[PDB]
Homo-oligomer: 310 residues x 4
Amino acid sequence: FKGNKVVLIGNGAVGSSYAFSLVNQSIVDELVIIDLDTEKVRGDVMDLKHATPYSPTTVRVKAGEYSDCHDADLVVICAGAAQKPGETRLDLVSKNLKIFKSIVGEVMASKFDGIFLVATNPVDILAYATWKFSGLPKERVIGSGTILDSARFRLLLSEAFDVAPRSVDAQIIGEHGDTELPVWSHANIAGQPLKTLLEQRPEGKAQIEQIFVQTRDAAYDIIQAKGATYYGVAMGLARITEAIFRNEDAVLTVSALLEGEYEEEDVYIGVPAVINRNGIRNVVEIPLNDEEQSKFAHSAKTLKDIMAEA
Amino acid sequence: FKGNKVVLIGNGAVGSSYAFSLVNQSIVDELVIIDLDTEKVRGDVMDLKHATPYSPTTVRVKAGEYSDCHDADLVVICAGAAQKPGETRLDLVSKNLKIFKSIVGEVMASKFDGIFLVATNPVDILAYATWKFSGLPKERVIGSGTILDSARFRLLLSEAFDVAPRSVDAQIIGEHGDTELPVWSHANIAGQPLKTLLEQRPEGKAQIEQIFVQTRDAAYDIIQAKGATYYGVAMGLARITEAIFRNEDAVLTVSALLEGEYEEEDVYIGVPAVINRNGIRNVVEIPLNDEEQSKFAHSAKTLKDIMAEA
Amino acid sequence: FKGNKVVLIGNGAVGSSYAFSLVNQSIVDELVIIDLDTEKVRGDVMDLKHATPYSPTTVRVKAGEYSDCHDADLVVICAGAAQKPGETRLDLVSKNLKIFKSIVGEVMASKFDGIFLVATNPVDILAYATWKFSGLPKERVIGSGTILDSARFRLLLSEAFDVAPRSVDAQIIGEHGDTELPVWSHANIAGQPLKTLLEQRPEGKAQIEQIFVQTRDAAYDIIQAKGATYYGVAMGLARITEAIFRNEDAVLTVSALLEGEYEEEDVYIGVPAVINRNGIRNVVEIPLNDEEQSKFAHSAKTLKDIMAE
Amino acid sequence: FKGNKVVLIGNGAVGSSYAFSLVNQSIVDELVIIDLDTEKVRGDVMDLKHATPYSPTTVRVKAGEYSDCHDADLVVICAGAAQKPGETRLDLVSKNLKIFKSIVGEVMASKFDGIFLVATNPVDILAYATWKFSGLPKERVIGSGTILDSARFRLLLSEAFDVAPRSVDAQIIGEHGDTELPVWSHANIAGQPLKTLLEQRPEGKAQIEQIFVQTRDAAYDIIQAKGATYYGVAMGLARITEAIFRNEDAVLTVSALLEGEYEEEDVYIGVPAVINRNGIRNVVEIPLNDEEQSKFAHSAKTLKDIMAE
């Protein structure tokens, strides 16, 4: 009768913020933090523990090492390497593949038998890699994918239409990156057709474009302003964590393996998927219009070309 | 029929973390952030907004200016200045008093008529200053005081006795700083007398001391490890925010004005106090043993001497 | 600075269940319960108070009288009369209009200046009546409307498609009653067109029909089984209460006054509407297909005909 | 990887209220309800399901049978028989022991391997019986015990001292019944000695007595008023359910087996105990003053005498 245990690997801005989200939300009762910067870990674990008496229900937080993954239920990986000058995107992929082969190797050697949630960029490539490296079933390896992109799109639509973001149903699918796309054929508020309504406004076509540009380029915009982006990603990772531990069967946009859905295979990419205590139960195949079909196929090709090069 | 509006003044590590706590907890529906580093604000507001579609209920976040305090319900002040080399503690007090005279002045000029929650250190001095400067009733000016110290003490006791921190009732009172004290005469788990039990262990007296030292010196220890401390303070500020907006009549340890309680007057200092939608309803005067009476009086004197110098 | 105060008028199965929901959810910190059956109230208030120590945040519960509405924020009306044999619907309407004239009058005389949430059936008629009797702006008088019918439709769809109910976006609009209608033109899971998908199944048209019939006739089915229905209603009333007190600007299907929307006027009826701390901020006018336009107009006509009588 | 599954056996006012609490709180994602009154169950399950779309997170509710316990995590027993005229307490005990032997037997035969939470009165006796009949470790059989009596005591103290109930630390221990006792040596608000403070008030000894009498006799008072008590019990059962499923290591007053603690053995009785995902981790032995030691020993003797018969 063990409790719910998350191990976070990588304690930078995103991981540390996700850890604080867990302490606020009490999704699980045990959080273990692993990072090579063991002084930052020790300092963060103290600071987080001191918050926990005001957590809704008990959360225990500790510094850990790979062996602590033995009975972990979810391993969340935020660790990795940024692109350097003169490095090609292929170089950046190769560099993080080497890191992930090592991390996933150490996790599996602990006898871990839970679910992976990968957040490191490029997330769709690294989720695919974690699946291959770990030998686990596809249900048990999840990339965060477009979980945050979809939230950014909903946030911006909720400002354009002045309603709660929870009342906006809107999705970004595809690569978490340059090749993502908005699903305007479905974006709505209680049935209100948002793109059609925006097209009625003056320069409405320009507004539609700017809503998507601001979604696509959100990280770049936050980094220019404050140097790093982390709250939005932490909250999205908490949302997935919730769906798993509360066994929700909730449809979320995450990076999932396709084996025929959307006429694509052997690729991880952002799509709506049903999430529950066993991970991704199934990918949801929704209708796409011509423009969306075109863009989604191009995104998948982009991801598959990159991996093939590697 | 207006909603619940918090304005945060000061968007460093503590303020930004408190803002993220609010986005996780949905205590209030509107958060406004004010800081002279307007680029950091703009970047944080974007990053926070992107989390809000997964907030439990709607939270709107925006960058603001003093005029936005006009209809704010709670103004939370984290802004201030750290001590510099060659500066005496008196110098550090004088420097933050000048900043607070300015901030409080601008807030009041907006026609603000809500509650202040002060977090800037030295918090008991600056809460007293905010009370004087604002002209408001003492109920409506609250320092965070020992809200975090008490949580640190409970956290450490919950580790020593291996139970949920929510099942540990333990308090730190006095100055948030060197002169704080533990209330061992009351610290218990369901009636278990913790100090008495610790005294039964081998070198039990040394354990009692180390539990308090680690509480008192927690910030110093976190700063040596990761350079700054912020999660624990953010969570404590969220806890007070909750008691106010949910009208709880909850007893929390905060910095409150004494006008006769504990035989002290004309001083703000950390004590248990009943918190509700009108701020501090009353200070709770609990029995203190001789050692606690001695230490609390010395803490109050320390704070009053400092203010008198200023 | 006052806290958040709800007064419940009518402590039957629905109202008492709604009170328990409030004790579980801690949406507000004060609940006052008013009912002519003062012994049942005294009992419920004790039993409820004993739960409050485990409520997420403080909830104070007490037995009250009309004067306690003076500074209430939300007054929730579940009180009324059921239809008797040899009574027409018109008779049933008239009887409750008399009760509401009395209740709303006593509430207003207390100096109440908050929001009404009407739950008593026929809820669209009685919401309209409460608006008229109270003289308050339409924003501050809300009927529960199809808040539960919509949840029932989502529940049944969540079973037919095996997914979280929270991941089903689907709505019932119109009269809370015989003339309500499903908005199949909109009902979807992350963009999956539910009616279209059901029509691909064998006897799929029969399944579509049965999902709606089971939604429409849910209360009848529950009453036949256990003699009364109340948990669904209580939870829907708690959801509206949450949107108000947390100032959400959440779109919910409630009974709202139309003044031109959907080409209808001078009628309360179930529609998506933005709810916040001020009550109904605005009705949302969604596109309706031919079938839905037809059924919605018929529902509104039905309600206006009966009120005109 | 399985989700969290509770099976409720006994769908009376207490069990149905507990089910509604679970729908409000989303502590677990699956609830199965078993009762011989299968029409009431069918009705409650429909009404409850219709609330679930507004639950914080997915809650699936269904009508079930004993075989559904096979992979349940928690089985909550509210079923039983009330005392009849001309029946002694011993008769009442014997009748429920027969019912429990049957229920626990059918549960165990399903392959259930989780935790029992017994709520049926007399709860300390029936918790002990369930431990014996099930052959499970003591950690995995929990009676509700004084979970509600403690909340009642805190509620009344919160009224006498005008503060949040969550800020009152106070406990009732012993038999859930006539021999329960207040732990005044501990009861406090942030260190304020409540009994001492009450004794300073005029007729303060009378107030102290009345706070306890109203705690002890609460169910009687509620039954006299509205004929049954259920909200308090449901919320206490939900609080224990929360501590298990969120693995809290929370100290709660429940009915636990003593094997030496408080100098008592071979008896279940209400005591503070650490609760986590494994059930009762350990009983907490708190210091008791002379009066409390006397009353606690008497309560345990009362329970052991009746079981020995």
